[PDB]
Tab-separated table of C-alpha atoms in Angstrom:
chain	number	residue	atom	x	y	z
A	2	UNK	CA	0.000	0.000	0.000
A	3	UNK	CA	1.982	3.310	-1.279
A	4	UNK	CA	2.483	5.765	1.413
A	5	UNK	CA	3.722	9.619	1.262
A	6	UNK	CA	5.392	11.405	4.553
A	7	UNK	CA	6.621	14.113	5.353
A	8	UNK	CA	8.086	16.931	7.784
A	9	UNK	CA	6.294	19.566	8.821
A	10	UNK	CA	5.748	21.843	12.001
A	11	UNK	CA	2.448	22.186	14.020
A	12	UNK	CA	1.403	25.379	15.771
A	13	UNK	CA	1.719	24.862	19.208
A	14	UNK	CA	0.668	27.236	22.004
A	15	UNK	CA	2.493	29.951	20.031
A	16	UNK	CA	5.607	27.861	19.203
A	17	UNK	CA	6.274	25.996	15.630
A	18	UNK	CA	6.339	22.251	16.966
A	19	UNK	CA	8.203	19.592	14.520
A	20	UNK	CA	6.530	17.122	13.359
A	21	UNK	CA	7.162	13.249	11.023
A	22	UNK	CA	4.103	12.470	9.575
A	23	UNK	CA	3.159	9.510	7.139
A	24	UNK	CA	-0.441	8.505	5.024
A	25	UNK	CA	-2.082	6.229	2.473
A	26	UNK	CA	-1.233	7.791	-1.077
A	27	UNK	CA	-4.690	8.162	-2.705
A	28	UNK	CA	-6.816	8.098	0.090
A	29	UNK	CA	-10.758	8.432	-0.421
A	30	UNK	CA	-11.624	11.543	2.179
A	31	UNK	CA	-10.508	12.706	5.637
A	32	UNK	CA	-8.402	9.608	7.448
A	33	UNK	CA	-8.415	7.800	11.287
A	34	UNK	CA	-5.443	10.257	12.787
A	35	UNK	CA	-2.807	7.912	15.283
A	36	UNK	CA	-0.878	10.442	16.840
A	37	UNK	CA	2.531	8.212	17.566
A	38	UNK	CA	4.238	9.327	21.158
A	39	UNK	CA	7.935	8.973	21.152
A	40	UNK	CA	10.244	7.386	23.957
A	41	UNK	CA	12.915	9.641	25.799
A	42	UNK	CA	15.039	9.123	22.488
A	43	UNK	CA	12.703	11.568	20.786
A	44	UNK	CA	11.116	11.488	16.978
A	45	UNK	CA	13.959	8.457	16.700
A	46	UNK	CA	14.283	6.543	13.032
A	47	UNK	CA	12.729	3.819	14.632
A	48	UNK	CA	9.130	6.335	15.653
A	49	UNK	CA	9.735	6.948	12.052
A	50	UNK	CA	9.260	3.712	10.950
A	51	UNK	CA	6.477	3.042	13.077
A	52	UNK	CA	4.114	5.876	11.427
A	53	UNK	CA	4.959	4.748	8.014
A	54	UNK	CA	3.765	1.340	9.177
A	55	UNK	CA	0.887	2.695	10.192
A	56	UNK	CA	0.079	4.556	7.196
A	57	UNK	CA	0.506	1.367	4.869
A	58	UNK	CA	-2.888	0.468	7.757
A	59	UNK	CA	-4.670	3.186	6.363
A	60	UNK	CA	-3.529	6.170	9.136
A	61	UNK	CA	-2.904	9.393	8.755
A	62	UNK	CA	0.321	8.531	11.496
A	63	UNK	CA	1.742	11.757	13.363
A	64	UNK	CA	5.046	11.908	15.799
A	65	UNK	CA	5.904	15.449	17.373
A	66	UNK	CA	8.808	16.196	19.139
A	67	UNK	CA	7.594	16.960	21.948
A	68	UNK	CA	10.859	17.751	24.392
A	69	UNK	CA	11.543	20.199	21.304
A	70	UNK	CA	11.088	23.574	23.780
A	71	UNK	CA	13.383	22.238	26.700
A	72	UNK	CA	16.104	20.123	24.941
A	73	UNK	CA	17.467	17.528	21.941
A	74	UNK	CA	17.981	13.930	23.009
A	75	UNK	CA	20.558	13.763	20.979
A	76	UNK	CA	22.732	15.679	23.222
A	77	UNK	CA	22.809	13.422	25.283
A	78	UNK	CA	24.829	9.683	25.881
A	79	UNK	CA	23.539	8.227	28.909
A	80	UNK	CA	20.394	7.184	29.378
A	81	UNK	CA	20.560	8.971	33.263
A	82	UNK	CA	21.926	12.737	31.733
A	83	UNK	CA	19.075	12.362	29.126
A	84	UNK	CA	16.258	11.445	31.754
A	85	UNK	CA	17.674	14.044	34.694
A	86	UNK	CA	18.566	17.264	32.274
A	87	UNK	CA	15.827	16.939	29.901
A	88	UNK	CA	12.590	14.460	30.105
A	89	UNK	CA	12.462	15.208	33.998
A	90	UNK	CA	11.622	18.914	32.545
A	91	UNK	CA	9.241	18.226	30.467
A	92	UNK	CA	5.800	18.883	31.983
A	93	UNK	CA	2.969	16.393	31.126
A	94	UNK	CA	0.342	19.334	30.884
A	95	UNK	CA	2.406	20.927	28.214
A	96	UNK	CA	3.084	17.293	26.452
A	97	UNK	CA	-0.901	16.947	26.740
A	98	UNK	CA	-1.852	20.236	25.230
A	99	UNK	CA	0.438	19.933	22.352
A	100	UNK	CA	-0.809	16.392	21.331
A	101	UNK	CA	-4.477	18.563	21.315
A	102	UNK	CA	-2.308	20.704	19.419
A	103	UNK	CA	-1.516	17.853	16.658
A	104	UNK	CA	-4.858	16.600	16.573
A	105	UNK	CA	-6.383	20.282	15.781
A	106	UNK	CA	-3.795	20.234	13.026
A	107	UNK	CA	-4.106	16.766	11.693
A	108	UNK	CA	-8.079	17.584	11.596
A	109	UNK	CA	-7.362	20.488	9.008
A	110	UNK	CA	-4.475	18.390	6.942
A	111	UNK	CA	-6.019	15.110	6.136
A	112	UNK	CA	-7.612	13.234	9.370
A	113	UNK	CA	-10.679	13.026	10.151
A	114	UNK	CA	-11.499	14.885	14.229
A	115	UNK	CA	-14.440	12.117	14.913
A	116	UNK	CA	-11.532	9.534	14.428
A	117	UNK	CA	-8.817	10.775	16.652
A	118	UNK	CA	-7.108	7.752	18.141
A	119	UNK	CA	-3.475	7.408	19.925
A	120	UNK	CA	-0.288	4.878	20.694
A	121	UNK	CA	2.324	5.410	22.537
A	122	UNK	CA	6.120	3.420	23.718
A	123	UNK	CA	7.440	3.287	27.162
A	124	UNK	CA	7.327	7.268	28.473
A	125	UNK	CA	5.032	7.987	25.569
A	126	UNK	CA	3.356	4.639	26.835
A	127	UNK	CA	2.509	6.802	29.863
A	128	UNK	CA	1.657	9.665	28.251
A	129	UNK	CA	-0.804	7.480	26.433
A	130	UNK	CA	-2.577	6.799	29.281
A	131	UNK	CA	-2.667	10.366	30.820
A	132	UNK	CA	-3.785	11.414	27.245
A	133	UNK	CA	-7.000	8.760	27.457
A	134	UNK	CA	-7.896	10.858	30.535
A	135	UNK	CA	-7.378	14.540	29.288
A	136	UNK	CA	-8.748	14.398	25.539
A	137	UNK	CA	-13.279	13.485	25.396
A	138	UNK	CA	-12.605	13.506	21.696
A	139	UNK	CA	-10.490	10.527	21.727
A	140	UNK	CA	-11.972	7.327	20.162
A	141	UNK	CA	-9.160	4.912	21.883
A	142	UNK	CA	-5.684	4.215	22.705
A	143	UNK	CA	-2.922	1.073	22.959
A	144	UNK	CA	-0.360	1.792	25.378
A	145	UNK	CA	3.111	0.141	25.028
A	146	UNK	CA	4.766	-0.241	28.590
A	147	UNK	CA	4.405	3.201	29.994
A	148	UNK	CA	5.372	3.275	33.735
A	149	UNK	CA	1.618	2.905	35.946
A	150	UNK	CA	2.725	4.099	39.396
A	151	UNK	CA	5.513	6.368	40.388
A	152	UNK	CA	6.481	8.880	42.885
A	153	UNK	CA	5.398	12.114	42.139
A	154	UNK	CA	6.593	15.885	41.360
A	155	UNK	CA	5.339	18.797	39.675
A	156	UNK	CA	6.220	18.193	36.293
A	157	UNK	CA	4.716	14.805	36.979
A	158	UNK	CA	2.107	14.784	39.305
A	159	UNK	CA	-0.452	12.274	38.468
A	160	UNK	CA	0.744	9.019	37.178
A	161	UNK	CA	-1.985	6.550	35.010
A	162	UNK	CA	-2.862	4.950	38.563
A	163	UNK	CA	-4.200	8.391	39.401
A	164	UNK	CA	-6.845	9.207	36.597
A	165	UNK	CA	-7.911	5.412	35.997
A	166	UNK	CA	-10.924	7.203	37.058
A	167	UNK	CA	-11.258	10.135	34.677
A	168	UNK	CA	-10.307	7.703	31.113
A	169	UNK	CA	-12.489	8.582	27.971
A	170	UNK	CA	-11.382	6.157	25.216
A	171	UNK	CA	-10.647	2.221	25.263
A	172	UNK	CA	-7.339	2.031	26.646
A	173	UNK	CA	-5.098	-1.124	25.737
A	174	UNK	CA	-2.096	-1.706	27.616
A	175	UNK	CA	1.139	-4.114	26.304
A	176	UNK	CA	3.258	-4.965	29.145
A	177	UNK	CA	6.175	-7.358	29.485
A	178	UNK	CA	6.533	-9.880	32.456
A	179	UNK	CA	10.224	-9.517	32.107
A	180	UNK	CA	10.359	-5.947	32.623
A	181	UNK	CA	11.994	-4.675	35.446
A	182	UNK	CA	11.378	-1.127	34.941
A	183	UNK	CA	7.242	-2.320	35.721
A	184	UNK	CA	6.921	-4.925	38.046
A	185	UNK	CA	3.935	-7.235	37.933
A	186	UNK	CA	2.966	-5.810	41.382
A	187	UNK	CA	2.632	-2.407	39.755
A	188	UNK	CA	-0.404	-3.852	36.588
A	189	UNK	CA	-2.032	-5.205	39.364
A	190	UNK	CA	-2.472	-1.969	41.323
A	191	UNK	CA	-3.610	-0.292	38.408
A	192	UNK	CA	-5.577	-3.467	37.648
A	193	UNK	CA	-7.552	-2.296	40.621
A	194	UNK	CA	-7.719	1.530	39.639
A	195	UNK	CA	-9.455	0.257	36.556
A	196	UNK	CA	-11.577	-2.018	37.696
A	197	UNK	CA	-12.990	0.912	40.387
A	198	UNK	CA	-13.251	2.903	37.962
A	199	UNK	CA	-15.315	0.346	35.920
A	200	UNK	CA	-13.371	1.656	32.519
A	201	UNK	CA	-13.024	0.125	29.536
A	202	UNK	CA	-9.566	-1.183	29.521
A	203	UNK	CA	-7.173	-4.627	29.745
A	204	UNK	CA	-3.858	-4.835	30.061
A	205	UNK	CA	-2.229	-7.815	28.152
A	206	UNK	CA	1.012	-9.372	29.871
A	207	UNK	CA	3.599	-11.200	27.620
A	208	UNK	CA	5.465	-13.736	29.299
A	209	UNK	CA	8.702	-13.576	27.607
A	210	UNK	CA	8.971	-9.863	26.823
A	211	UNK	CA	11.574	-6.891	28.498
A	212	UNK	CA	10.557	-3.190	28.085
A	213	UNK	CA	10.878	-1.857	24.852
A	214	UNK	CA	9.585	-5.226	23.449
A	215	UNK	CA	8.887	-3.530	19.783
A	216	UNK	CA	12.021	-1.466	19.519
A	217	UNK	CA	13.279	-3.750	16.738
A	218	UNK	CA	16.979	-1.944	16.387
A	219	UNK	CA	17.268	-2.712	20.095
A	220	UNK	CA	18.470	-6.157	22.052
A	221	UNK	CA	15.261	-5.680	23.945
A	222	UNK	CA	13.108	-6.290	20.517
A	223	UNK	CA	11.213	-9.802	21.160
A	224	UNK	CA	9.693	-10.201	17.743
A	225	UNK	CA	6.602	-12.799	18.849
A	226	UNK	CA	5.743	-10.264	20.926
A	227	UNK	CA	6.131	-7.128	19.365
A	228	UNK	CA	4.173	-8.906	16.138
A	229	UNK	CA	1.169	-9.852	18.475
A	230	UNK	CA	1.337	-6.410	19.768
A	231	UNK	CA	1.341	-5.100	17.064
A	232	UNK	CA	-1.653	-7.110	15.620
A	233	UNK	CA	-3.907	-6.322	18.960
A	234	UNK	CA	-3.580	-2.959	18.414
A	235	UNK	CA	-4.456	-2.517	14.848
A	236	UNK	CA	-7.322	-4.863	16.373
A	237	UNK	CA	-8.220	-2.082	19.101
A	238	UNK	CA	-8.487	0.451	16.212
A	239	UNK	CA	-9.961	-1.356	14.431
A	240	UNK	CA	-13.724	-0.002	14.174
A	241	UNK	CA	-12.995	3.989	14.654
């Protein structure tokens, strides 16, 4: 299925936002919008890749770089610098107005706003959930081992354990069993947020998987995995 992409910026609460964006070639009328939330690493090759695969599903796939006002992960080499000097200052409220920011723009450049759906990979997998809570427009959302409970700060102070209770959309989460980084204990506790909340939601556990399960350039890629995952959440989508 031939796909076209592109760079381009999105206004963003006054600021030109950068932005990788890939579609269907010919397509028919306005298209089902997946925003794509990066990891730390930023609009990476790899997120790249991702909304071009999405595209050849019939998205209209969008990635913005969202640390893009306090810093480039590319200046950094270690995974600690990067995560203390730069994604530790980047405030979810600001990373949850600009992805309104994307969809507003994706709704006047080829998506459709009544289809408006999101994924997102390990601290975009959080943001994913967080996002599920903030946006009523959103028709659903597949979270790829975002981080469920945490300590909190003011950049950060409401984790997806906290606003279980205020999700919009469909949330599905994929989690590994091997990941260290989001201990079993941790799905269970949000397990119970959920379930109190009586949202739509499931989390789906894979025995043999680390975190960053689909990062196929990585050693942490486990390709049974990531190609389930991959095929549940074009499932999830499916209908919107």
């Amino acid at each position: 299925n031939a796909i076209i992409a592109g760079e381009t910026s999105i206004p963003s609460q006054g600021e030109n936002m950068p932005a990788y964006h890939a579609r269907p070639k010919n397509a028919d009328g306005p298209l089902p919008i997946v925003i794509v939330v990066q990891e730390i690493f930023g609009v990476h090759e790899h997120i790249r890749d991702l909304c071009r695969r999405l595209a050849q599903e019939g998205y209209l796939a969008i990635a913005p770089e969202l640390y893009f006002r306090q810093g480039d992960p590319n200046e950094y080499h270690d995974i600690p610098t990067l995560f203390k000097e730069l994604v530790s200052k980047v405030p979810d409220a600001q990373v949850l107005a600009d992805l309104d920011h994307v969809a507003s723009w994706a709704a006047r450049h080829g998506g459709d706003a009544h289809r408006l759906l999101i994924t997102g990979f390990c601290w975009g997998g959080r943001i994913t959930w967080l996002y599920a809570a903030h946006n009523p427009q959103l028709k659903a959302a597949v979270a790829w081992y975002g981080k469920l409970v945490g300590e909190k700060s003011l950049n950060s102070p409401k984790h997806p354990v906290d606003i279980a209770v205020d999700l919009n959309a469909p949330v599905l989460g994929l989690y590994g069993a091997k990941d260290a980084s989001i201990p079993q204990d941790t799905v269970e506790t949000m397990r119970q947020a959920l379930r109190a909340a009586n949202a739509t939601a499931e989390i789906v556990v894979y025995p043999e998987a680390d975190h960053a399960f689909n990062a196929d350039y990585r050693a942490s890629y486990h390709e049974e995995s990531a190609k389930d995952g991959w095929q549940r959440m074009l499932a999830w989508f499916a209908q919107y």
